[PDB]
Design a binder for this molecule. Structure first.
Ligand SMILES: NC(=O)c1ccc[n+]([C@@H]2O[C@H](COP(=O)([O-])OP(=O)(O)OC[C@H]3O[C@@H](n4cnc5c(N)ncnc54)[C@H](O)[C@@H]3O)[C@@H](O)[C@H]2O)c1
Ligand SMILES: NC(=O)c1ccc[n+]([C@@H]2O[C@H](COP(=O)([O-])OP(=O)(O)OC[C@H]3O[C@@H](n4cnc5c(N)ncnc54)[C@H](O)[C@@H]3O)[C@@H](O)[C@H]2O)c1
Ligand SMILES: [Ca+2]
Ligand SMILES: [Ca+2]
Lengths: 497, 489
């Protein structure tokens, strides 16, 4: 059964969002966002120029002062109103996210906005608990501290969880009393513009959340260079993260936090149930079509279990349902873009070339309704070794690498023998093995007998080359403030002169 | 006589460098060479990092209280050797013994003692999600970190950087200023005598653009803590950004305002301004070098400043009564003198000083007289730029809103202060100032408990306080899932 008559016309040209309204860019620059399931253009999108960025900062400086002068509970109520709107519009926002990203609606309608709103809801309730300290020195003197807003901060987003990233960056920044200028990925700009409208409808003062689509090397760099931005929070690849660090270091002194992906290990212990292990390995590799920074893409399996484990993976890969992204039963989508597919395919070819055994997948999906999409089959390599390119490098597609191991000390060494350090996990029913292995792994995000859950309360970020700083949890609210120490000297000051 | 040629400190002992590079540290009171000092080369730095990697593992495997006791032993030694260390600091820096013997080691050891006691309180958290799952976090050491020190408070900076780093379970490689490398080497020996494991505190003298750069570029250093000027701080930020991903914290000086309120007692205000400008001969990063005085009080305030400047006692740096020294080096004196000449050339009125000290016993040292400019305006070079010498700029003002604006009209933001007996004025002014370190009716006290660092271009991050101990750990989040994991595939 063929499915045609599905032309979707273009959206309106997308503008910038500055100071509570859409405004035309003055860059002379536009770019297109493409539906990765069909190749059709979703919208032409305007890119913010240097003067547009400067106006956005001045808008943010003005809005931040209004926002910071409110009470803590007034701020809490406005962010909760935005949460309420996000819950009401979940399905509509999820459909837009599916169009822009290629992720199944079964994901976007249950995870992306749900968990993005979860984090905003969490920080909204913590605003009144944000406190300084008081330190007695002696009867005649004491110190108190204030946690003051930084001012105007910049968030730079990635294309795999667009609205979730926008919410996870903006929520602590705004709750700490800052304004944020958010630069979405040029691959997926659309839901960030919706979020800005929602924030306005909730009562957020004009300028406190401005959204600037544009190209990383242009708009993004204009932001990192601006002298009045106090902090940058970046999600994306290592290459662009290094440009952001370098450009920010060359400009006004600012703090930079970063989440840069990884090559996270999944350690299947010698006492693990292999159905559970296989279920975890599937969720650690093929959710959002393998486009998750925390994926467990090095799956370490005991040699004695490798043959059986491979069969359990093949059985579950055979259940994956690629298809209509709006269909209830679809759980696998195209990649986010055709250029990204080309890169993933180059990684797959290196796996073949370097002698890994192809267990399944390894090609594009074919036939009517896949031929127009950026699809890559769910792919598993086995007989992998630690020197292979597919094992060493983040692929960001549906490519699992199975590595066999002999003993626990060995697998810990190998799990840690990476420049990366984002996530890790272990499958074992044993109390001592679970905690003792996890305590030795050099990663910031660790799952035991699970994968992927990221509660609002739980700080997440990378060790080593996978990141600086954390997101979520109480600590991240604090990191969007700066400490002022104040000493009150009530005794007579003694000069030596 | 000259000291013995100074070597690197790596893995619990002094070791000859392999750079082919030496430099001289000069006694700024005499111009004489104190010592020839070896500089660490690129291969020396790599050996220091491997030593620190080995030592950090021993250190971090000890119990918390075992680490506390060793740092407390070092405190005990520092208290006992206070005067000897102070005398060496005075030779290397030119600061009077009346300062070094009362402040530098005393407050450096205060911060080490503070953090030693806090190690056992460093905790993670636990977060219940539901009956079948919970999260817990660990605060883990970073590994090997680097501190890069400045020349005005050499051993105090070495202790304020190493104390939280070591207390959190890290090893630190410390790079002292090439102007003042001597007390950091003494500190390294003291830590070993206290029982610090070999490699946990290594000291690499050398030139900033060589040794300093090799450290900031090394792939296995997890964090850089830097104190110094803006220009060198920018180089450190850029070189670190081009190298391994690492966090960098920085304290970079300021042009801090002291606001004298219209209801202030002017004797108190003059006393605070003197202490905010002429301690350590003006070589303190938090100095209140823009002194804002109500127009109605300016004449009387100047008389009171002149009276107290007239009392300053420059002389024998080991005499009890001396309270003013030469500057740290002859190159630094030249730069301060250029600032003084610009204040003259731009039309500021010289109230006092403005020249070198002269005569027997001053002619051979890097002395600049305590200097005060008045009739200053906000566009003047001496008002806009950090001098790091004994140069006060007096600026008159008319109203409270104006002085708040002008106080904040700087790229800097390290410290600030206000002098006022009024409750509302004191707190309301301070809450509006864009600075990290704020003093009411005082200046310069920096308790171990109090976090200190800069706003805006004066810094990133904080030192001292509970938060700095936490800042030398990294958070690992661990989810324990006890229910049956659900896969959608
Ligand atoms: N969650 C993550 O950590 C994550 C997300 C997406 C991609 N990645 C990785 O990054 C790789 C490359 O992806 P990509 O090139 O499509 O994304 P990218 O990493 O270049 O994009 C991330 C963001 O950075 C911006 N950016 C890029 N260059 C910039 C610059 N010079 N200054 C400022 N901002 C700049 C982009 O516009 C976008 O907003 C992917 O293949 C994947 O491995 C990681
Ligand atoms: N407490 C402070 O913030 C402080 C201290 C001293 C000087 N200063 C300011 O800085 C000005 C310049 O002083 P300076 O040049 O004699 O000191 P600096 O700021 O250059 O030196 C500080 C430290 O930085 C190191 N350093 C320099 N270049 C480096 C590099 N490329 N990589 C790594 N480390 C490097 C130096 O070796 C030294 O250890 C002074 O006039 C004063 O205004 C501020
Ligand atoms: Ca798109
Ligand atoms: Ca010297």
């Amino acid at each position: 059964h063929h499915h045609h008559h599905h032309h979707m016309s273009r959206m309106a040209e997308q503008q910038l969002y500055i100071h509570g309204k859409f405004v035309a860019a003055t860059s002379g620059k536009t770019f297109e966002t493409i539906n990765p399931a069909t190749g059709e253009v979703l919208a032409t999108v305007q890119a913010a120029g240097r003067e547009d960025v400067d106006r956005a900062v001045k808008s943010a400086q003005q809005g931040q002062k209004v926002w910071a002068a409110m009470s803590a509970m007034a701020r809490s109520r406005i962010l909760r109103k935005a949460v309420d709107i996000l819950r009401e519009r979940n399905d509509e926002l999820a459909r837009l996210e599916t169009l822009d990203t290629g992720k199944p609606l079964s994901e976007t309608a249950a995870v992306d906005i749900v968990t993005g709103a979860d984090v905003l809801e969490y920080y909204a309730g913590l605003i009144p608990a944000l406190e300084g300290s008081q330190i007695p020195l002696r009867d005649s003197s004491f110190v108190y501290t204030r946690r003051e807003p930084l001012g105007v901060v910049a968030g730079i987003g990635a294309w795999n969880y667009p609205i979730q990233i926008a919410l996870w960056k903006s929520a602590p920044a705004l709750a700490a009393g800052n304004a944020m200028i958010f630069k979405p990925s040029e691959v997926t700009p659309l839901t960030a513009l919706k979020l800005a409208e929602i924030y306005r409808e909730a009562g957020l003062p004009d300028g406190v959340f401005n959204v600037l689509p544009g190209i990383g090397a242009e708009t993004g760099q204009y932001l990192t260079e601006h002298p009045d931005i106090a902090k940058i929070s970046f999600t994306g690849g290592v290459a662009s993260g290094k440009k952001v660090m370098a450009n920010s270091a060359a400009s006004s002194l600012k703090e930079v936090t970063m989440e840069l992906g990884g090559k996270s290990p999944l350690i299947i212990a010698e006492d693990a149930n292999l159905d559970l292990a296989a279920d975890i390995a599937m969720m650690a590799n093929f959710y959002s079509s393998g486009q998750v920074c925390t994926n467990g893409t090095r799956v370490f399996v005991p040699a004695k279990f490798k043959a059986e484990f491979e069969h359990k993976i093949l059985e579950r890969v055979g259940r994956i349902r690629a298809g209509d992204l709006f269909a209830d039963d679809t759980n696998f989508g195209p990649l986010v873009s055709f250029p990204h597919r080309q890169n993933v395919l180059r990684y797959i070819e290196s796996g073949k070339s370097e002698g890994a055994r192809l267990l399944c997948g390894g090609d594009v999906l074919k036939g009517e309704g896949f031929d127009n999409g950026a699809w890559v089959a769910p792919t598993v390599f086995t007989d992998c070794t630690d020197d292979m390119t597919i094992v060493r490098e983040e692929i960001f597609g549906p490519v699992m690498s199975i590595l066999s191991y002999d003993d626990e000390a060995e697998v810990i060494r190998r799990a840690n023998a990476t420049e990366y350090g984002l996530a890790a996990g272990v499958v074992t029913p044993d109390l001592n093995r679970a905690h003792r292995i996890i305590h030795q792994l050099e990663a910031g995000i660790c799952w035991i007998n699970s994968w992927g859950e990221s509660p609002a309360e739980m700080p997440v970020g990378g060790y080593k080359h996978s990141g600086i700083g954390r997101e979520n949890g109480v600590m991240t609210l604090q990191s969007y403030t700066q400490v002022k120490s104040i000493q009150v000297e009530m005794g007579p000051f003694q000069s030596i002169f």
